[PDB]
Design a protein around this ligand. Structure first.
Ligand SMILES: *[C@@H]1O[C@H](CO)[C@@H](O[C@@H]2O[C@H](CO)[C@@H](O[C@@H]3O[C@H](CO)[C@@H](O)[C@H](O[C@H]4O[C@H](CO)[C@@H](O)[C@H](O)[C@@H]4O[C@H]4O[C@H](CO)[C@@H](O)[C@H](O)[C@@H]4O)[C@@H]3O)[C@H](O)[C@H]2NC(C)=O)[C@H](O)[C@H]1NC(C)=O
Ligand SMILES: *[C@@H]1O[C@H](CO)[C@@H](O[C@@H]2O[C@H](CO)[C@@H](O[C@@H]3O[C@H](CO)[C@@H](O)[C@H](O[C@H]4O[C@H](CO)[C@@H](O)[C@H](O)[C@@H]4O)[C@@H]3O)[C@H](O)[C@H]2NC(C)=O)[C@H](O)[C@H]1NC(C)=O
Length: 368
């Protein structure tokens, strides 16, 4: 295999399908084995994982209440993958792309794996992944990613926002009636007062709850980046990693620039490896990449606001997605096929950055 980077793909159209007549690059291999279907709906399926099943005697008692909100009947299929099942399930799932599972198995320690697992599960099967310390507040068929009524309200009240490379005859709001392919919630507002490293990025999305269609290119790019970083950062890669990476950008693979074993991996390593900072980097890289190469990218922001002129200028003059587009979000926004939810949606009751209570109509999941 060759292991491309995600941070120097400005020369590649990330939405573009690569076809073959009658392979080697891990980006193309993931696309081939897990194709993206923007026309199909999000699967009505919930994924959770823990060391043990829910009826296990060691299942933590403080989680048993939370897990019932997800596992019910929901007019939605629920799957809890116990630790004994994770490896054979990923082996069955990523059989077409075995280097992905090799890397997962080589990850030192339990937190890197549990972080990485959510992206693997969603990319291969879609649905919702939510951590065990989360509570579902409103049924998922009532979410704005799912409820045809809500999606129609977004379509009927908001016109596409143009950008430098856009062609208006291609931009229509009703494309989103096929549902977003990725649904994420703000964790930290980019305009907040706190600039400690409590959160790892300026624009930060909750990693504890994510919804997606299988094959979404952002999940592809996350898996690429984490796969290549793992192999170049562990003591037993099983492959001659130095011969398989981009020769122009060697410092972008080994995690210490940002070998690791079970004893030397710290919290800021996890942060730079599988955590919410790499998630947000990949997401913004993707947003800016698709505007560069496509004339039909749908941009909907019902909150347009104080940053309007800068937003308009970033889009229409610089062809770039400004961080201000995601500031003071009170209603969902659309970037291509990514729906970004307000802080209240997956982070209610934090009494900060405008988060409302889990009683708000925008509150969908409470993080415990
Ligand atoms: C997709 O979205 C659409 C649009 O939002 C959804 O359709 C609407 O669904 C709402 C549900 O919130 C519905 O409003 C209810 O209609 C009921 C039947 O007509 C009413 O009986 C009900 O009244 C109660 O709730 C109100 C809250 O606004 C209270 O003000 C009112 O006093 C009533 O409260 C009593 O009952 C509740 C429990 O029901 C209790 O907590 C109270 O204490 C009190 O006893 C609502 O008004 C709309 O009618 C729907 N709109 C349309 C056009 O159909 C749709 O359901 C979503 N789809 C999915 C799958 O979720
Ligand atoms: C996997 O994803 C990670 C996360 O995105 C990715 O690491 C990132 O790589 C890029 C590109 O190498 C880094 O981007 C910046 O590039 C400029 C240009 O030289 C630097 O100046 C930046 O750092 C300094 O300057 C900034 C001010 O201008 C400061 O904010 C900064 O702290 C430095 O002083 C920076 O290098 C980006 O920093 C990293 N991100 C992280 C978290 O390290 C990685 O390349 C991907 N790997 C693969 C294999 O795809």
């Amino acid at each position: 295999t060759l292991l491309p980077t995600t941070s120097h793909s400005q020369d590649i159209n990330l939405k573009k399908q690569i076809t073959v007549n009658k392979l080697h690059n891990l980006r193309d291999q993931l696309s081939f084995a897990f194709p993206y279907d923007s026309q199909a709906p999000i699967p009505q399926r919930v994924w959770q994982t823990w060391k043990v099943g829910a009826d296990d005697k060691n299942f933590p008692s403080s989680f048993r209440t939370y897990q019932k909100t997800w596992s019910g009947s929901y007019s939605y299929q629920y799957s809890l993958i116990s630790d004994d099942s994770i490896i054979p399930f990923l082996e069955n799932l990523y059989a077409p792309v075995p280097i992905v599972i090799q890397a997962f198995k080589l990850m030192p320690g339990n937190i890197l794996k549990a972080d990485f697992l959510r992206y693997l599960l969603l990319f291969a099967r879609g649905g919702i992944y939510s951590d065990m310390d989360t509570m579902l507040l409103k049924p998922i068929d009532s979410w704005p990613s799912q409820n045809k009524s809500w999606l129609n309200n977004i379509i009927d009240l908001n016109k596409p926002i143009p950008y430098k490379n856009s062609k208006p005859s291609l931009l229509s709001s009703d494309e989103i009636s096929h549902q977003p392919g990725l649904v994420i919630g703000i964790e930290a507002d980019p305009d907040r007062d706190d600039w400690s490293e409590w959160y790892a990025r300026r624009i930060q999305f909750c990693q504890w709850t994510i919804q997606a269609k299988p094959g979404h290119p952002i999940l592809r790019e996350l898996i690429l980046n984490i796969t290549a970083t793992t192999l170049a950062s562990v003591q037993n890669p099983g492959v001659p990693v130095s011969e398989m990476i981009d020769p122009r950008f060697e410092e972008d693979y080994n995690v210490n620039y940002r070998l690791k074993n079970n004893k030397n991996v710290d919290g800021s390593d996890i942060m730079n490896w599988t955590g919410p900072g790499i998630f947000s980097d990949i997401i913004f890289e993707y947003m800016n990449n698709v505007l560069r190469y496509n004339s039909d990218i749908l941009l909907i922001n019902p909150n347009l606001r104080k940053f309007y002129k800068k937003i308009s200028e970033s889009l229409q003059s610089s062809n770039s997605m400004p961080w201000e587009f995601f500031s003071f979000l009170k209603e969902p926004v659309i970037v291509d096929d990514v729906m970004v939810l307000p802080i209240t949606s997956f982070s209610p009751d934090v009494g900060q950055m405008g988060a409302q209570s889990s009683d708000d109509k925008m509150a969908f999941v409470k993080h415990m």
